[PDB]
Protein backbone atom coordinates (compact mmCIF):
# COMPACT_ATOMS: atom_id res chain seq x y z
CA UNK A 1 0.00 0.00 0.00
CA UNK A 2 2.05 2.90 -1.34
CA UNK A 3 2.69 4.90 -4.49
CA UNK A 4 5.07 3.23 -6.91
CA UNK A 5 8.68 3.92 -5.83
CA UNK A 6 10.91 5.58 -8.41
CA UNK A 7 14.69 5.67 -8.65
CA UNK A 8 17.16 3.61 -6.63
CA UNK A 9 14.45 3.03 -4.01
CA UNK A 10 12.86 0.38 -6.26
CA UNK A 11 12.37 -2.47 -5.42
CA UNK A 12 11.30 -1.60 -1.87
CA UNK A 13 13.93 -2.41 0.73
CA UNK A 14 11.55 -4.19 3.11
CA UNK A 15 10.50 -6.71 0.47
CA UNK A 16 14.18 -7.41 -0.20
CA UNK A 17 14.99 -7.89 3.49
CA UNK A 18 12.04 -10.29 3.70
CA UNK A 19 14.24 -12.77 1.78
CA UNK A 20 17.63 -12.23 3.47
CA UNK A 21 18.53 -12.66 7.13
CA UNK A 22 20.09 -9.19 7.44
CA UNK A 23 21.06 -6.24 5.27
CA UNK A 24 24.73 -7.13 5.72
CA UNK A 25 23.95 -10.41 3.96
CA UNK A 26 21.78 -8.67 1.34
CA UNK A 27 24.58 -6.35 0.23
CA UNK A 28 26.85 -9.32 -0.57
CA UNK A 29 23.92 -11.27 -2.04
CA UNK A 30 23.45 -8.43 -4.53
CA UNK A 31 27.11 -7.59 -5.15
CA UNK A 32 28.18 -11.13 -6.05
CA UNK A 33 25.29 -11.48 -8.50
CA UNK A 34 26.14 -8.09 -9.99
CA UNK A 35 29.70 -9.29 -10.55
CA UNK A 36 28.40 -12.48 -12.17
CA UNK A 37 26.13 -10.51 -14.52
CA UNK A 38 28.97 -8.14 -15.42
CA UNK A 39 31.26 -11.09 -16.20
CA UNK A 40 28.54 -12.64 -18.36
CA UNK A 41 28.17 -9.40 -20.33
CA UNK A 42 31.95 -9.11 -20.70
CA UNK A 43 32.19 -12.68 -22.01
CA UNK A 44 29.10 -12.32 -24.22
CA UNK A 45 31.35 -11.62 -27.21
CA UNK A 46 33.10 -14.99 -27.04
CA UNK A 47 33.72 -17.57 -24.33
CA UNK A 48 32.29 -20.52 -22.47
CA UNK A 49 28.80 -19.81 -21.11
CA UNK A 50 29.71 -20.89 -17.59
CA UNK A 51 28.25 -17.71 -16.06
CA UNK A 52 24.53 -17.47 -16.79
CA UNK A 53 23.38 -13.96 -17.61
CA UNK A 54 20.46 -12.06 -16.10
CA UNK A 55 17.32 -14.07 -15.37
CA UNK A 56 14.71 -11.30 -15.45
CA UNK A 57 14.73 -9.54 -18.81
CA UNK A 58 16.67 -6.27 -18.33
CA UNK A 59 15.53 -2.82 -19.36
CA UNK A 60 17.12 -0.34 -21.72
CA UNK A 61 20.70 -0.15 -20.41
CA UNK A 62 20.03 -1.15 -16.81
CA UNK A 63 22.95 -1.40 -14.41
CA UNK A 64 23.96 -4.94 -13.40
CA UNK A 65 23.35 -4.15 -9.72
CA UNK A 66 19.78 -3.04 -10.43
CA UNK A 67 19.16 -6.25 -12.39
CA UNK A 68 20.62 -8.27 -9.52
CA UNK A 69 18.31 -6.58 -7.02
CA UNK A 70 15.26 -7.02 -9.26
CA UNK A 71 15.93 -10.73 -9.76
CA UNK A 72 16.56 -11.15 -6.03
CA UNK A 73 13.16 -9.57 -5.34
CA UNK A 74 11.53 -11.90 -7.90
CA UNK A 75 12.68 -15.05 -6.03
CA UNK A 76 14.96 -16.35 -8.79
CA UNK A 77 18.19 -16.71 -6.77
CA UNK A 78 19.40 -18.92 -3.93
CA UNK A 79 22.22 -18.07 -1.52
CA UNK A 80 23.96 -19.96 1.27
CA UNK A 81 25.49 -18.00 4.14
CA UNK A 82 29.08 -18.69 5.16
CA UNK A 83 29.94 -19.79 8.71
Amino acid sequence: GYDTPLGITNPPIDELLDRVSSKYALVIYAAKRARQINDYYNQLGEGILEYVGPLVEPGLQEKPLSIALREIHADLLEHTEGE
Binding site: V52, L55, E71, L76, L77, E78
Partner: peptide, 9 residues
Protein backbone atom coordinates in the same frame (compact mmCIF):
# COMPACT_ATOMS: atom_id res chain seq x y z
CA UNK B 1 17.87 -21.59 -8.53
CA UNK B 2 17.49 -24.65 -10.73
CA UNK B 3 14.03 -23.55 -11.87
CA UNK B 4 15.40 -20.19 -13.03
CA UNK B 5 18.26 -21.81 -14.95
CA UNK B 6 15.78 -24.19 -16.58
CA UNK B 7 13.37 -21.39 -17.50
CA UNK B 8 16.05 -19.13 -18.99
CA UNK B 9 17.27 -21.99 -21.20
Amino acid sequence: TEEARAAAY
